[PDB]
Design an enzyme around this catalytic site. Structure first.
Site, PDB file in Angstrom:
ATOM      1  CG  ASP A 115      -7.301  -2.346  -2.877  1.00 49.90           C
ATOM      2  OD1 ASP A 115      -7.740  -1.121  -2.809  1.00 49.90           O
ATOM      3  OD2 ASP A 115      -5.721  -2.751  -3.558  1.00 49.90           O
ATOM      4  CB  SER A 165      -0.762   0.016   1.155  1.00 51.89           C
ATOM      5  OG  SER A 165      -1.837   0.535   0.729  1.00 51.89           O
ATOM      6  CG  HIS A 180      -6.298  -1.917  -0.094  1.00 48.55           C
ATOM      7  ND1 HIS A 180      -4.810  -2.206  -0.710  1.00 48.55           N
ATOM      8  CD2 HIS A 180      -5.572  -1.145   1.114  1.00 48.55           C
ATOM      9  CE1 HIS A 180      -4.294  -1.507  -1.076  1.00 48.55           C
ATOM     10  NE2 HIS A 180      -4.015  -1.094   0.377  1.00 48.55           N
TER      11      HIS A 180
END
Ligand SMILES: [Mg+2]
Ligand SMILES: [Mg+2]
Lengths: 315, 315
Positions: free
Chosen positions: A256, A161, A286
Site C-alpha cells: 500500500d 482511507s 489498500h
C-alpha cells in the site's frame, strides 16, 4: 510478498482490464462513481444480520447528511458505545451501501453501535466540503447522543482511507477548537500527508495505482488549485502537537502506498503518549478492509478493529 | 508520567508500612517467594467463572511440569483455539495461582482455552531451565493437542514480563529447530534484551520499586556468572532474522524500563513482514496486566490482548 488471495484478486483485476472497458480516468465522475460503487457493493462479503438498521438524516452545514445506524446482535442496552464511520473512496466515490456489510460486521464484533455517514463528495462538493460534513456529523451526534442511542462517554470516529483521514481530522478539529472530541479513533489505512511522497508512495508510483497518474481523477476533483497542501485537513500528519488526541487503532496494509504515512501517524500518536494500537497486515492491498468477498484478511482486519474498539469501551 | 489510578496504587503501597521496611528482596526462595506470590494472588481481580478448570502434569526434561487448563464460558466445541500462557515473576517468583484470575478473563474474552504453565524457577533451577520447561510445555501440548482439547492449527503462546520473554523465545526455538511453532504470540511487556540497556532501562538507573542492587539479586538468581548476555534465550531481540515467526500482539507499559525493548521487538517483527499488533498503555506500570484488583487499565489490557487473539483465531 503478496498472499495467494491477494495475487488472485490482482490477476482478476488484470483480466478485467483486458476485457476492453474504458478506464475510470476516461469517465465523467458521476458515471464512474455509479459503476465503481456497484463493484464496491458487490466486493464486500455478504451482509451479516444485525439487531436493527435505521436510516435518517439531519441538517448539515450546507445540505442534508444521511446516516445509517447498525445495532449489534444480542445487545439490549439503551445507550451503546458508538462508532461514527466514514466510508472511503478518495472523497469522490463510496457511500453507505459500499461499506454496509463491513459496518454490520464491525457492529456485531465490537458490540458497539455503528453510524455510517453519507458525506458530500467531490467533484460536486470539493475540499473542504466532505471534511466539513464529517466534522458536522460528529458534533451533531455528540450533542444529540441520546437521540442516536449513543453513550456520549463512548463515541468513536473511524473510517477507511479517505474516511480514515476524515476520522483523524475530526479529532484534530475538535481538539484545536477546544471542544469535546471522540473517545477513540479507528484509522484504517488512512491518508495522512498530502504534502510529501513517502518511500511507499514512490514504490507504487513507480508502479500501477490505476496506471500511476490516475490519482488525478480523484485528486483534481477534490482539491482546488493553490490549496496549501500542508493544510492539516489534507495533511493531519503535519500537526505540531499530537497530545490531547484520543486513543487510536491504526491499521496499515503491507502492499500500500499509504502504508508509511499511516505508520508515521501511529508513531506520532505513540510518541505523544497517546494509547495507540498499531497493526500492519503484510501481503494485502489498500481497500482489503471492505473487499471482503475476495480477501479473507479483510474479515480478520474487521474483527481485529472491532475487537480493539470493543475492548477499549468495555463491551 | 502516570495515570490517576496508578498514583492511587502507589499511594496505597506507600500508605502501607510507614515503618516496617518490608520492600526488601534478599530471600525470594521459600518464604520470600511465598509472601510476594500471595500478594500477587491478592493483587488480581476476583476470578471470573469459566466453563471448566482442570489441573494436571506431564513429564518435562528434568521434572514434572504442571498446568491449569481454563475452558471459556459459552464454548461447546471439543477442540478449541488455545493459548499456552507463561506467568511473569523474573523466572524467580509467580505461579499458576498468581495469574489465575488473568487467565480466566483471557479465556472468557478471547473464547479460547488458556493453559497456564508452572515451569521451574530460579535460583533452584537457573537459566536455561525455565526456558527449557517453557519450550518443552509447548512441544508437548502441540504434539498431544487433542488430549488437551486444543485445536493444533490454532495454538498460541503468550506471557507477561519474563513470561513474555519465554513466549518470544519458544517461537524462535521452534523456528531455529525446524519444527512447527505457535500460530500466534501474545507478548505482554516482555523482556527482550539482556545485552544492552535501552533508553527506558537507563532512565530507571536508580531502580524500579526495587533498588538496582535488589534487582541485581533477581538477575543473579536466574543467570549464572559468565553467561553470554547475547544468548538469544536471554536476548531474543538480538535474533539476526525475524522471518517465519508467528503473528504477534505486543504490549508495553508506558512507565516501565522494559518499554523500549518491547516496542523494538514489535518493530523487528513488523519490518520482517510479520502480522504484528503493537500497543503502548501510557501512564501505567510493569505488572499492571495482572494487578487488576487495583488497575482498571489491566482489565482493558486483558480484554485487548484476548480480543486481538480471538479475532486472529476467528472465534
Ligand atoms: Mg451490500
Ligand atoms: Mg486468585
Amino acid at each position: 510478498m503478496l498472499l495467494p488471495e491477494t495475487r488472485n484478486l490482482l490477476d482478476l483485476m488484470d483480466a478485467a482490464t483486458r476485457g476492453g472497458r474504458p478506464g475510470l480516468d476516461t469517465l465523467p465522475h458521476a458515471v464512474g462513481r455509479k459503476a465503481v460503487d456497484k463493484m464496491s457493493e458487490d466486493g464486500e462479503a455478504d451482509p451479516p444480520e444485525v439487531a436493527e438498521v435505521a436510516n435518517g438524516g439531519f441538517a448539515g452545514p450546507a445540505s442534508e447528511i444521511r446516516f445509517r445506524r447498525y445495532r449489534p446482535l444480542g445487545e439490549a442496552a439503551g445507550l451503546l458505545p458508538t462508532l461514527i464511520y466514514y466510508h472511503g473512496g478518495g472523497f469522490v466515490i463510496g457511500n453507505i451501501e459500499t461499506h454496509d456489510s463491513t459496518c454490520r460486521r464491525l457492529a456485531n464484533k465490537s458490540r458497539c453501535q455503528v453510524i455510517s455517514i453519507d458525506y458530500r463528495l467531490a467533484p460536486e462538493h470539493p475540499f473542504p466540503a466532505p471534511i466539513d460534513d464529517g466534522i458536522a456529523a460528529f458534533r451533531h451526534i455528540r450533542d444529540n447522543a441520546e437521540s442516536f442511542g449513543a453513550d456520549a462517554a463512548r463515541l468513536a470516529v473511524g473510517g477507511d482511507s479517505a474516511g480514515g483521514a476524515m476520522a483523524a481530522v475530526v479529532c484534530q478539529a475538535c481538539r484545536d477548537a477546544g471542544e469535546t472530541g471522540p473517545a477513540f479513533q479507528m484509522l484504517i489505512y488512512p491518508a495522512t500527508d498530502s504534502s510529501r511522497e513517502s518511500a511507499s508512495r514512490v514504490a507504487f508510483a513507480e508502479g500501477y495505482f490505476l496506471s500511476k497518474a490516475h490519482m488525478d481523477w480523484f485528486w483534481e476533483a477534490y482539491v482546488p488549485e493553490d490549496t496549501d497542501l500542508t493544510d492539516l485537513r489534507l495533511s493531519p500528519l503535519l500537526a505540531t502537537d499530537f497530545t490531547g488526541l484520543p486513543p487510536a487503532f491504526v491499521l496499515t496494509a503491507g502492499y500500500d502506498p499509504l502504508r508509511d504515512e499511516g505508520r508515521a501517524y501511529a508513531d506520532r500518536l505513540i510518541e505523544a503518549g497517546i494509547k495507540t494500537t498499531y497493526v500492519n497486515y503484510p501481503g494485502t492491498i489498500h481497500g482489503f478492509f471492505s473487499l471482503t468477498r475476495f480477501l479473507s484478511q479483510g474479515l480478520k482486519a474487521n474483527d481485529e478493529a472491532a475487537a480493539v474498539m470493543g475492548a477499549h469501551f468495555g463491551t
